[PDB]
């Protein structure tokens, strides 16, 4: 009538979202947006990245040439997927600095092996074992050459293989560790062997130790795997009076965006830049809670399953 | 069905904006949203999503640089993630505090803008409403909402009504 009322107010929602602030641990707001991806499809998208399923083989087993991993020869990938069911079925071995060799080869993204001649004079080549059978007969790592004595002598090997190409060569070699002193002398004649590989920039000297280890595939012996990189203009020098597991050639090294991941998730036909062991996830949100291990354009890993960013004023219900 | 202000009340039936007006006059009740104050808050909130990610992307590298200098063992890495996850929550918490402060701030600015318009022709009822002491029809309300209310037009009438009792 003669007067009027003019009220000021703000909007509200019947039930709002809880967020955290500097003063309140849980203050209800009219709107907020989730910043943490917490769900995955459970499958790894084969596109756009070239995914290579290891199945029963590990990257190292394929590298050395384990009989059941011969299908991965000259194989390439963007992401190598390693399964928990993978197993070794060759000569028992160990790799000092295993993580580094796995990481190094994973980064190269290829197993391109080029065979080289290597003259091994005064020794027996192509040694094998019943622990690493290939076909009906005995065998050995396809990429390694087991040298033993010829007749009654194992001479001091002194071979050189220069790198005249315009890329880095990766050579894989090893040192045999016999379980008994009779085995040592029967194979390499000398009671104590020695293997040294060097380049103009590097050098590795190792004296094998004679010791029995826990039985693996009916064997108490092992092999220690080592690796050497030879840059262009450098030379590979191998000197050995015994126990040398010679290389057959080199792997061409590349520098790229390739890597390796341990996962048991199935692979599926779909597109996702981001891959985690739990499967692919969308990369629309800035953070993620699925796995700290990731590949591709991924949100940064966070421990929280939710981080709500206030997108509205505070929500108070009307009375 | 008396109308109430923002003091301890929110308007469920207001979806066109965040702040607005609600009136009771001779021509009945009404409601309207205030777009200038609403749009001012929205412009700030648009900024915050980029800012919350432009700085979280700054700490993530900062933390890694410190741990890279130390260099990763699993107890070292999990510490890094715990420290980074704590930093992330704190940034978002700080922005949320700012969002609540700037949205509450915008409400007060609108209340004061309206008080200045009415000057001495109205009184603050205390619940976020003004009791305007003259006949203010629908056209008179829109002039307050769009910022053109001239108190001198109603000074003689308004002051005469307050004098009454």
């Amino acid at each position, epitope marked *: 009538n003669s007067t009027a009322t003019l009220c000021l107010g703000h909007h509200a929602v019947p039930n709002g979202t809880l967020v955290k602030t500097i003063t309140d641990d849980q203050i209800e707001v009219t709107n907020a947006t989730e910043l943490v991806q917490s769900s995955s499809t459970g499958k790894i998208c084969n596109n756009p990245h070239r995914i290579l399923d290891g199945i029963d083989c590990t990257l190292i087993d394929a590298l050395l040439g384990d009989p059941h991993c011969d299908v991965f020869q000259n194989e390439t990938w963007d992401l190598f997927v390693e399964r928990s069911k993978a197993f070794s079925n060759c000569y028992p071995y160990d790799v000092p600095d295993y993580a580094s060799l796995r990481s190094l080869v994973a980064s190269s993204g290829t197993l391109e092996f080029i065979t080289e001649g290597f003259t091994w004079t005064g020794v027996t080549q192509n040694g094998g074992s019943n622990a690493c059978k290939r076909g009906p007969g005995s065998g050995f790592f396809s990429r390694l050459n087991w040298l033993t004595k010829s007749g009654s002598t194992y001479p001091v090997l002194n071979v050189t293989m220069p790198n005249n190409d315009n890329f880095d060569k990766l050579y894989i070699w090893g040192v045999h560790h016999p379980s008994t002193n009779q085995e040592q002398t029967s194979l390499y004649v000398q009671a104590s062997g020695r293997v040294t590989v060097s380049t103009r920039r590097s050098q590795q000297t190792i004296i094998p130790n004679i010791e029995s280890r826990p039985w693996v595939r009916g064997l108490s012996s092992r092999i220690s795997i080592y690796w050497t990189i030879v840059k262009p203009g450098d030379v590979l020098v191998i000197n050995s009076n015994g126990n040398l597991i010679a290389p057959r050639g080199y792997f061409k090294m590349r520098t790229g965006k390739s890597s390796i991941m341990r996962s048991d998730a199935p692979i599926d036909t779909c597109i996702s830049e981001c891959i985690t062991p739990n499967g692919s996830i969308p990369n629309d949100k800035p953070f993620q809670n699925v796995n700290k291990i990731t590949y591709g354009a991924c949100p940064k890993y966070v421990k929280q399953n939710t981080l709500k960013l206030a997108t509205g004023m505070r929500n108070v219900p009307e009375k | 069905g008396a109308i109430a202000g923002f003091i301890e009340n929110g308007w469920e039936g207001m*979806i*066109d904006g965040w702040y607005g007006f609600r009136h009771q006059n001779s021509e009945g009740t009404g409601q309207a949203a205030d777009l200038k104050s609403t749009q001012a808050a*929205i412009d700030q909130i648009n900024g915050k999503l980029n800012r919350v990610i432009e700085k979280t992307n700054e700490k993530f590298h900062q933390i890694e640089k410190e741990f890279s200098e130390v260099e990763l063992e699993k107890y070292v890495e999990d510490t890094k993630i715990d420290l980074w996850s704590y930093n992330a929550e704190l940034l978002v918490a700080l922005e949320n505090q700012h969002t609540i402060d700037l949205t509450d701030s915008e409400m007060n600015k609108l209340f004061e803008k309206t008080r200045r318009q009415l000057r001495e022709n109205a009184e603050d009822m205390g619940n976020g409403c003004f009791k305007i002491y003259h006949k203010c029809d629908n056209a008179c309300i829109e002039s307050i909402r769009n910022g053109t209310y001239d108190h001198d037009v109603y000074r003689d009438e308004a002051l005469n009504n307050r004098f009454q009792i």
Partner: antibody, heavy 125, light 108 residues
Framework: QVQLVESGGGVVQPGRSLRLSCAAS????????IHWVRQTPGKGLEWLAV????????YYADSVQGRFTISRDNSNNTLYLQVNSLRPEDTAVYYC??????????????????WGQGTTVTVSS | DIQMTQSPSSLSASVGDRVTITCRAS??????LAWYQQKPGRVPNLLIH???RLQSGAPFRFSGSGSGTDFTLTISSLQPEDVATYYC?????????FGQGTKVEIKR
């Protein structure tokens, strides 16, 4: 199936008035800001007018004042553009559009999410 | 009122290229700018809104990085499907003016 189909376009002689209609189907039509946009043949889009989520508010472009009139029947899930005093600047395709929510609000000024196929209105005798 | 000045008015680029359109305003509008695509014969679909957010079911090649009175819609690794006219729209306040348009054509 979230769609909206127009109707009403056609021929009208200069000086008379038309009424286009928008028919929403498959969503909370009652809770949506709806716009109108036209295009000169092979030129560019021109934004014309907007209607609040309830009809209360209406805003029109500068070169479109006086002549046009939005309106809506929420019971009927229908929108109207009601062009009057048609001129040679009206030959064009006329589109609907839905405004997107902004931080949970049915704000009147936002971007256009869903569009109609577009009826064409050519003023000529 | 304000006045959007889209540019370039039209262009031709090759597949896999990185194209960029720029919407300019005669007065600040904040982030209240949207980008629209109109493929030949098709109705326009929304691409960017709020200057930088991307719209559901919109190809990831499209992204918007601007604010104030200077925005940029950028297509990276342009594809053949991206043949169309791109419009920017200022929705800060009425009138929700539209850009003048930008026609993107393939070079092959």
């Amino acid at each position: 199936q979230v769609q909206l189909v127009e109707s009403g376009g056609g021929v009208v002689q200069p000086g008379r008035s038309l009424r286009l209609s928008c028919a929403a189907s498959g969503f909370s039509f009652s809770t949506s800001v709806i716009h109108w946009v036209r295009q000169t043949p092979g030129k560019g889009l021109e934004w014309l007018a907007v209607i609040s989520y309830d009809g209360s508010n209406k805003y029109y472009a500068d070169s479109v004042q006086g002549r046009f009139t939005i309106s809506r029947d929420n019971s009927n899930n229908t929108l109207y553009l009601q062009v009057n005093s048609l001129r040679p600047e009206d030959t064009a395709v006329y589109y609907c559009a839905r405004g997107i929510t902004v931080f949970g609000l049915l704000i009147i000024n936002s971007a256009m999410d869903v569009w109609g196929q577009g009826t064409t209105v050519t003023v000529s005798s | 009122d304000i006045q959007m000045t889209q540019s370039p008015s039209s262009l031709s680029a090759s597949v896999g290229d990185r194209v960029t359109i720029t919407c300019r305003a005669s007065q600040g509008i904040s982030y209240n700018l949207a980008w629209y695509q109109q493929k030949p014969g098709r109705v326009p679909n929304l691409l960017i809104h709020a200057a930088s957010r991307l719209q559901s079911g919109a190809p990831f090649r499209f992204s918007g990085s601007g604010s104030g009175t200077d925005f940029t819609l950028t297509i990276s690794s342009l594809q053949p499907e991206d043949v169309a006219t791109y419009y920017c729209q200022k929705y800060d306040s009425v009138p929700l003016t539209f850009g003048q348009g930008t026609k993107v054509e393939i070079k092959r």
